[PDB]
Design a protein around this ligand. Structure first.
Ligand SMILES: *[C@@H]1O[C@H](CO)[C@@H](O[C@@H]2O[C@H](CO)[C@@H](O[C@@H]3O[C@H](CO)[C@@H](O)[C@H](O)[C@@H]3O)[C@H](O)[C@H]2NC(C)=O)[C@H](O)[C@H]1NC(C)=O
Lengths: 438, 156, 49
């Protein structure tokens, strides 16, 4: 038996769906979202880490000249200096006083621990959310793990569920992402091959275990000072470290809708937005025949107390008469008020009491147990407390009923003014038609 | 690593005041978990006192190495509903204090326009019905003079 | 109130009664140790000073 509903994408909300087959007693399903997980698709662009400058020991040619040889190394530098007269601990070598030459060489490399401490630059698109939903009805509990797109069906107790695509297409991630350890940043990184010295991406490597490396760190060499061997050079400090010290905020601490950003794999957990359409197909064993169900007539409801707090702050007493003791399935037919339970034991005494949660000054909703119906109206008061440690248990509907105190005052005043205006117009038209009839 | 001390929490109207006592520089951050959040991070080094907003959507704060703590405000106000018309407006101004004034001004303006138009129509009708008899020295028709309050109370 | 002036109060210096409100809370000991953890808001006299 095909049925369809729409239920909110909020974790811990007690959603109850009423399935009312004409020949059978209605039943109520309780669906709850234990958690969600919205995960994007990633294309690794490159990997960044701290660099390491390799400076070989210099080549000093005594009584001669040397010539520089080019090499294919990242950010490679080589020069020759003439007129050197170096020294050692024991004496000055290169016996020729002024006909000597030094070859200075330096280049840059990926650090020794780049496979343990590095940042990854990604492009993120086409998020896909999973979810985990607890479904209970009749006498089945039990929690399933589903894909929220209309392309996955799960069976609970012989009932076939499909949780359709999310109402919104909102994702907290931008197009470009930087992931470091357990932290995700909405960053606009430089492309591959166009990094800059001193900032993020001065050295770029395509993959953790790749062999290529692109380096742009502004390395330079200088003449050694006379009488000593040191190969002096100057270079802009690492861009990865200056990124670490000044990356700025994160997405873990900043994302909207209060959703927890985690990594490995990158995902955004419990990120309350949108609606989830649900399509269900039930067997015949789920329902009960109308013969063995109790029959109830003459139903009225009255509210004992109401206070529109976040918890279940309204109490409702409901009277009837029944032929035999049994069990019925209650439901509230408006989202202005949310009931707490889905089934109620009916007895010959003729009273049941139910607790509901609301958020409006005057609700008016129709409540049914088994097959009967009744309209409940209430006059509700604000709570005294200011702050609570738990989420709202209602649907946050605030517009009062048309029969509430305030909007009934509005009707009375507007009706009086309208009657006055109608009398004015009638007097004027009567006078005009008297003038015309003559 | 150590665990920071639980701050002292004081509840206000859509606000929380936290008293913070660190032993060593500890990081304190918070965010409003609605559609457009209110971010903040800070490195607290001395004993201080902070005020942070808690809307109906909720809030959370992360203090030190502790787990983050979420807090939700509740639809509380100071007007008294189901009373006189001047208390319902207070009640609906305490919560949503931006559309209540707009709606009340609109309703009051509409009522004023209606009442002015009605009074205008009566004035025009009386002028129309009295201008013909006022071009001749005629009787006021004491049956008409009593029913309609015209300019001459008893003079002709 | 804890953490502020007068978190502990005594009528006189030698009075045998004492009022204390310091938010002293016990904790679960870690596995394989004997140490009695607790946490407590610092003194209010030092903060006032
Ligand atoms: C459907 O199944 C779930 C999970 O089996 C049921 O929730 C579980 O309810 C029991 C009973 O209240 C919980 O046990 C108690 O938890 C408290 C928490 O502090 C603990 O102090 C008690 O000592 C006891 O362990 C259990 O934690 C809870 N599990 C979960 C995951 O929420 C649920 O009640 C079932 N629904 C129906 C209608 O039977």
């Amino acid at each position: 038996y095909e049925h369809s509903t729409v239920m909110p994408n909020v974790v811990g909300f007690p959603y109850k769906a009423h399935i009312e087959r004409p020949g059978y007693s209605p039943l109520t399903l309780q669906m709850q979202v234990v958690e969600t997980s919205l995960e994007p698709t990633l294309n690794l662009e490159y990997i960044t880490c701290e660099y390491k400058t390799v400076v070989p020991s210099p080549y000093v040619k005594c009584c001669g000249a040397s010539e520089c040889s080019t090499k294919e190394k990242p950010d490679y530098q080589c020069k020759v200096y003439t007129g050197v007269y170096p020294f050692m601990w024991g004496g000055a070598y290169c016996f020729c006083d002024s006909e000597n030459t030094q070859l200075s060489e330096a280049y840059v490399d990926r650090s020794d621990v780049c496979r343990h401490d590095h940042a990854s630059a990604y492009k993120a698109h086409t998020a896909s959310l999973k979810a985990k939903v607890r479904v209970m009805y009749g006498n089945v509990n039990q929690t399933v793990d589903v894909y929220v797109n209309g392309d996955h069906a799960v069976t609970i107790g012989g009932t076939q569920f499909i949780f359709g695509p999310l109402s919104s297409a909102w994702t907290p991630f931008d197009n470009k992402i930087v992931v470091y350890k357990d932290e995700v940043f909405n960053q606009d990184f430089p492309p591959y091959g166009s990094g800059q010295p001193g900032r993020f991406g001065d050295i770029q490597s395509r993959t953790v275990e790749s062999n290529d490396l692109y380096a742009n760190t502004a390395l330079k060499l200088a003449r050694p000072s006379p009488g000593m061997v040191h190969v002096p050079y100057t270079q802009t400090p690492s861009g990865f470290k200056y990124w670490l010290k000044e990356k700025g905020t994160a997405l873990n601490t900043k994302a909207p809708f209060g959703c927890q950003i985690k990594t490995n794999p990158v995902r955004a957990m419990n990120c309350a937005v949108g609606n989830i359409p649900v399509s269900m197909n039930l067997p015949d064993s789920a329902f009960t025949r109308i013969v063995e169900a109790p029959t109830i007539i003459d139903l009225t409801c009255t509210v004992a107390t109401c206070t529109h707090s976040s918890d279940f702050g309204g109490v409702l007493t409901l009277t009837y008469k029944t032929d035999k003791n049994g069990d019925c399935s209650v439901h509230s037919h408006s989202n202005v008020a949310t009931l707490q339970e889905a089934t109620a034991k009916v007895k010959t005494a003729g009273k049941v009491t139910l607790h509901f949660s609301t958020a409006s000054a005057s609700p008016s909703f129709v409540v049914s147990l088994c097959s009967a119906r009744a309209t409940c109206s209430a006059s509700c008061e604000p709570p005294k407390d200011h702050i609570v440690p738990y989420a709202a248990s209602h649907s946050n509907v605030v517009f009062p009923d048309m029969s509430g105190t305030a909007l009934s005052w509005v009707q009375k005043i507007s009706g009086g003014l309208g009657a006055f205006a109608i009398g004015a117009i009638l007097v004027l038209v009567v006078v005009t038609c008297i003038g015309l009839r003559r | 690593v150590p665990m920071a001390r639980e701050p002292t929490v004081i509840h206000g109207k859509r606000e929380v005041t936290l008293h913070l006592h660190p032993d060593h520089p500890t990081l304190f951050s918070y965010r409003t978990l609605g559609e457009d959040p209110q971010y903040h991070e800070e490195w607290v080094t001395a004993a201080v006192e902070r005020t942070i907003p808690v809307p109906v959507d909720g809030m959370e704060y992360h203090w030190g190495n502790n787990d983050p703590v979420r807090l939700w405000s509740q639809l509380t106000t100071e007007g008294k509903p189901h009373g006189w018309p001047h208390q319902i407006v207070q009640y609906y101004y305490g919560l949503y204090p931006a559309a209540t004034v707009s709606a009340v001004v609109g309703m009051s303006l509409l009522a004023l326009i209606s009442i002015f138009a009605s009074c205008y129509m009566l004035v025009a009708a009386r002028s129309k019905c009295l201008t013909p008899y006022a071009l001749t020295p005629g009787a006021a028709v004491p049956w008409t003079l009593g029913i309609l309050c015209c300019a001459p109370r008893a003079h002709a």
